[model samples]
Target: PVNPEKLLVITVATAETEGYLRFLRSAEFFNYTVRTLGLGEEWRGGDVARTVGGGQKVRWLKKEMEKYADREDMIIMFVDSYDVILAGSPTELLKKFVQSGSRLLFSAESFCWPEWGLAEQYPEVGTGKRFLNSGGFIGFATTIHQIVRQWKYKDDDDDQLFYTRLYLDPGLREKLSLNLDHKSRIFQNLNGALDEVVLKFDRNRVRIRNVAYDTLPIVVHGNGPTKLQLNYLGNYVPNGWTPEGGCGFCNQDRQPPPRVFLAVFVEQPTPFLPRFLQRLLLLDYPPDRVTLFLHNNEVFHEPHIADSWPQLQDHFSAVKLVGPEEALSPGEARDMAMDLCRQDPECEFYFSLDADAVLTNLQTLRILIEENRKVIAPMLSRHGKLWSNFWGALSPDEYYARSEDYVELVQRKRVGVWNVPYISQAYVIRGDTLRMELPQRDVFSGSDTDPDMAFCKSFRDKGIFLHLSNQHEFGRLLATSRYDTEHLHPDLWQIFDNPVDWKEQYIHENYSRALEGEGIVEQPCPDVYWFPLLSEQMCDELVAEMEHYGQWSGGRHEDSRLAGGYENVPTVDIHMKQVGYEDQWLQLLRTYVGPMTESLFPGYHTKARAVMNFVVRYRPDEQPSLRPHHDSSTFTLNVALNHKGLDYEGGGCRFLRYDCVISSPRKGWALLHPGRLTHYHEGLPTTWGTRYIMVSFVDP
Candidate 1:
């Protein structure tokens, strides 16, 4: 008997598609000697994947198999180059093949191919897998060569049907010792039998166990539309990631933590640049091992870049900041950064981050490096939107379209690292890839094309595959729909277009309860309510913005910044409308405060906007107190802007009718009460220090 180590493994590949590389990796893992044919030949099959075709693959293999014709007892294994992963070694496969009791055994599937008309002609299996799959087969080289020597079909002809006819012939089946892998002991075809098999860990390596037959298949082939499913399984199968050891490939080929150059670009007006920079600073990688390259196209982001640059340069090994002063466009800045990383031999990985993508997981960069892909991104999506960093598929016009598996992929129902057509917002490219596959400048300046589309297409056209990993919930995609730089707190106005960013920047901590439908509103006084209505950061920014605008109204009954150009009851204040927070504040009332108000009040619903939405500033020097009065709104929200004892002193609210004096309210806490009929209130004195409060009247 011949040694199985000498078995010949052959497949056909024209390009290094993600699937083909993965196939090669699996072969490498098992130490299989593989011969790949037609590396530069044109495939004339005309996209007949779902039809009667791929005879060219069989023909190529037949010609190659003839080379070892005289080497008796030599074995040859032919499998699809793409959409296949080796789960077993050459020895294991050959052992299974010998036990199959046939010289020529093909993988088995659930259906008869191209000639479904010949289904009845096939021999009855009675108890096991019946139909033959062309994706995988193993046999003695001489006998297999004799079997496929009759191949005469054109390049686009049906390879499956040709094999099917020969296998169905009673005389040829006996003559050539032909048989199908009925139990799938050696080859498991995954087209229709996907659910029948599951990945089983056998203490050392990953193996697939067929649930129905209790058999462990040595070889796996994803025939037809089962390729995506195979990719998901391949993510953890064959020692890719073991439950005991975490990701098996993560620490492969690299002993030390890599030297990464962080290429961060503020391409457009992003709402989260401050937070993004903060996250970058907080990344778990050692600062001494990292190099930083930052580009800010928006002049609005210049201050942040300037602020972060010194800290970065001082801490990191190297730092480069291309500010708006550089006169470089968004595309140019990113391209230059890519080139910079490519030229630097010390940089092992080039990490590209758009300011709009907030890296929630500080370990994200470390994770991507360990996955060892040529180009990969951590999957990120908007909080409640389907908009993700990776496009599932590309339409004919090269725009994004939803794929059948998109939702599952995003929600992690199909959890894995996957080959996507396009990736942007944030991705990590190996430094070697940037050097070899550097795209030209016009790749980003195509007429009317989105810069990302142009950049990704150039890479795709040259066969550089893009990958997105959802194996971990890494971060979030910030909303940048209508970024207005014309405000003290511009991100606050993003509530309508970029609610995720707005909430992150503004909304209350307990707002999560209302979102989760947990109606737990606290009634501080009789019918007067309070709830967690604003984040401390929100309160801080609101105060900062009000201070920054520096347009506080005089403490008088006459006010101009109101409806009808009048204020019957006015104190020192600044309307949210004055500072461009009118729309955003209203949205907060509608989404956050409205839920508790409706659930607790039961008779009123807020319009989310009130003419009296203003922040009050009461100082011992200006106005210490207000006389008790009835509010003109149907309901009211009094959000405390600062800590009662710490930020100020002797500041609180009082109801003259109920005679209730509530003092020392917590910062960012709100007091919601009836505005018209039942609840009457007044602003108490700030005797020692200045008091700040955000008040809103709704549904008048």
Candidate 2:
């Protein structure tokens, strides 16, 4: 592959004059190769003998240069001048000249002398002279060639008139006059006319634009009387003049303004003093430059009392405070905090903290700045007996034993710390980064206690929530503090810790629980399809590809292919392979079968469980076909193991019942059917190839 940055310059001139040499030198300055083709009056003499005239001469020159005409990558600079000089390297001049879209860069006399008579007849061309300053220099490349090729010259008169009218006499202006009312005439003329001809005759290739000095000077023609000032700029620089950083990065010196404020919102009142003091005195960061916004609710009330101790207040200063009066609800508290944030726009980033949270070290700010994290949470754990002063702390073994069930719950749900749905303790939030939107009321239509859950659910999709799991072992260390002490009064903490077990005492009275009469009969077919059943091989191939591509997680045995095989896959692969396929290939089937399953199996679980079943059927000349028919109202699973595209042709399945004929399964492909809506389908004919698949059905 050729590097796109490398440029090639081609020039067409009548003779090698001083002006042309100057142009060639200018092109060289920019590190461009100049391939010049010089034509003479002899070419025109032959055209005259053949009655081809000037048009024939131009045509023959073009034909002679046709071999190199349409090189798409290279630019062509055609100069028709009596006298011209190369100021700088032609390479540099061409580079800058081409940047401006043009077809011809006629130097001083080229535009003024009116060598072609069409300009005298066309007022538009005469008027166009006002837009030009100097015009002897002409730049023609593939783009201009395209337009000239499509000129539709019939006879010598037509050819002469076209050349004079379009090129010599304000070509662009004359073309524009052809479509007075058309808004896109200029674009159409240049691209559709000029570009198309160049591409067609020039190998579907190069694009051309004219470069004049007014646009971009690739050549300077010192034509009669008002010759180009060779010594005016201290050098007779060529067209492609290369100036170091000439027009690039001229405004990079300006710097952005400094940040004004840093904001934080506190929800829980844990051992904030240690962290606060660290931020205040220990950290190298300027404490006076920071402003702390504290939002204290009922959770912090007791902590507030403990935090107000002289030891805590001695080190830190609380500039602004927003605390709930008499344990206001979580929603009210969050609104208050956000309201404060909205009131202060000077703050750059907002930090949201929970009551039981405490920053272990002053490096918290450094971590935030270094990672450029917006929403972050600290690692959380239960308090250990050895580290706690209250309630005789439990040992690590005992603590794990007590928390094992919850951990199992998390594992079963495939929830990671970073993706946790709810965290009531402490976290840091960037203030300005908080999207100004409220949580959906519909998601929490039922009774809800904490608004934090609502807030989390709302913006869950927009930004990432990262868990600082190992950051200084902060969360675990803080959990050991006395702040972990449970409240016994009213048994609120007990109810919170064991909500499901105490359902009879708490939820039974407050919430409804019903068996709703039910005796099991043959229920309708379940609306679920085990998505993994489709494209099992494709899923395997994708996993293998990911491993090959070095994208597999390296930390755990289950994350890498060496440990987890095709069977024991991660939840992400399972969900992605399933949902993504459904969204892409199985959309039609989903639309057809989804409604049928829902109608027959009302009130049934929509999720289908994966089952292992694989099979293959082979036929030589005749393709396997499944006649159109309804299936039993049961969940269907299909898996293909054979490599796709190798074993078959025309053996795909098709659903003929739908308005559109849906194609069928290929090798290593599967389809789930609801049995009713998609009952009519047939296996397409196959010339030669093995048809292999595993099909199974599960009942409600």
Candidate 3:
């Protein structure tokens, strides 16, 4: 036995008759380890042998095979022989059988002739020949037993009676078996059999053949008499009766090659006519080989426009029409095209083009095919400019830059069109790849997001590169002048041209009046008198302390300075400080103005949301001290903290608005609303005392 562990032959027979003996001889010649199971008689005595019905026999065979199924050394073959013949060595057949890898190898019924008594027993064996039932041979094992077990047999009742009648019908000889007229009995039994069992289990799994005589008989039921007569009488076999070698079958050649199909989706058919025709005629590829799928919903009742376009029917023989009445949107049209391509396994690639785009050159298409790109899209443009913009809005520079970066890394060969995040108007795709990637929903409605972004993301998520063509830059540019450009606020145009200077122009324009008046000063009050003077030494000490804090914080100059000026006026390049003029200054201010507005105005409170504007400033100069003036907005509080004796010559504030003058503060503070008419003040020339102070403002 050649590799007995790897070959198994299983035969199912109702009785140990001559037919069964022939099967054993064939199995032994093939060197396949065989398992024969007798289905057991259908009835008791009376010269009537019993046969199991096909359905039950198949089930019983499956159960028996399941025992040795898991062994890698065994293969199971199920055979039922009415009249089986073997023309080739069983070993060769077994080798071919093992190599085929078919889950089930079923023998066609026509392999046998009717002259054998077996034909009379089973009339189905000699019936009109299409899928004739001859329980001669069927084979499968562990890998395929599960499928057979699940197969439901149709016509179970008739199958039982037919087997019984074939073995027991006693009227055969007297009735001239040839003219037995068994139609009524057989038809009823067959019809009843069919009604009792399922005809097809899984359509994908079943294969059929009409004539099996020429092929080495895997299963032959009733052909015994013809073979025997021809052999014994020395008669020549007829042309059709002769069996050929190698499983007695012709292996088909000329397999079709893979191709990329292009499906062009369009709303309007006319615009695409030129490009569609160009692809068919101008492509270097054979016209017949290219599958052009055109999806359009624009054909209407107008005969003049529709009939005039005869070129659509004339130029492209491969064109397929889809969804003309269905009003397919751009996305749906592409999907329909994909579905059409999928129907034919021969189609290898699929391409989608915009209805309005024309393929001006064939190089890109050829490159795409050669590179085996999943998709290729032309750069989209209008009127001449690059149409990188999607949804009519230009892609921001950031988006384009990122797209370019991705392209450089993924598409190294730069040979064909590949995937891109966005394509303007035309593109091609491999049929199988696109089918795997494209979703099955409508994609052009307002509710749908752009499909290209999703398509690109899908490719990226799968670790594939999406390519784009740079040649699309030659396409048309978008027309910009068509949109409305009217501007509102004519003066607003000046804002873009020149911004107004705040200090030089705005400050001078609004504050000239306050600077032109005489300065004034106020006195300290009695209860809060005797405030100490702030010496130059004290001012220097405070400056050094601020500097140290600033260093420890690692703060930038801008941050430290802002921190120092929190709730206080920020200093300019020139400034002076003073102390102790508080009580007198407050009393002097009350003489001219009513109680402070914040105190008078019921809900008034300082603007205090970390506003940067509350910071204030002061300046010391030989120039006339700022004319005493009360700020019309925002309250001001001035507290003197620096003091000097005789040398300091020029700094003190006078309030002309209140007609009051005050010396620089010594230690304690003074509070007043600088906005009030009574609170105007200017810094006094410090010819005799040091001035150190804190000044802050509040806005309601």
Using lDDT, give the best candidate's number. Answer: 1
Give the alpha carbon lDDT tens digit for every residue of 499-558 in model 3.
121122111222222223222222243111122222333334433333333322111212
Rank by TM-score, highest first.
1, 3, 2
Cα lDDT tens digits, model 2, 123-154, are: 34331231122212234445445545644433
Q: Residue 613's C-alpha lDDT in candidate 3?
A: 20
* Decoy 1 TM-score against native: 0.67
RMSD of each: 8.4, 30.3, 29.6
| Clash counts for all predictions | 0, 70, 85
After best superposition, candidate 1 residue 23: deviation in angstroms? Answer: 2.7
lDDT (CA) per prediction: 0.78, 0.37, 0.38
Clashes of 3: 85
Write down the lDDT that model 1 would get.
Answer: 0.78
- Which stretch of 10 consecutive residues in model 1 shows the poorest summed lDDT? 558-567
Residue 111 accuracy (lDDT) in model 2: 37
**For every model shown, what is its TM-score relative to the native structure?**
0.67, 0.26, 0.27
